[PDB]
Protein: CC-Hex-KgEb
Amino acid sequence: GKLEAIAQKLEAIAKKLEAIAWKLEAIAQGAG
Amino acid sequence: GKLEAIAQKLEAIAKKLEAIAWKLEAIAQGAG
Amino acid sequence: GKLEAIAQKLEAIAKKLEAIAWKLEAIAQGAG
Amino acid sequence: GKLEAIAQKLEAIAKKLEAIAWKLEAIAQGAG
Structure:
């Protein structure tokens, strides 16, 4: 049924979290 | 400060979500 | 800077995960 | 089967994200 569709939404959310992680690391690292 | 540490926790959470996604796909796919 | 904005995106993601949790529970519970 | 258990793990993850959101807001707000 919907389980595979739900899984793909979770993967998309995981990618958003990774992007936010990298955003935070960049805020920490500044101009270097 | 703590931003890089927070980022790593978010990456760990992202990996948990990916694992759950694959778990759900496996429930859907059964014995094949 | 952007930290409060990032926080609100994380809260929005948390709400998406809660919605998915309830969706999965509903798939499990069927017509009752 | 496992769907309700998976849902509870997703809810726990959502709560971790909310905690991180509030942590980031606190970093932004400082001593006030």
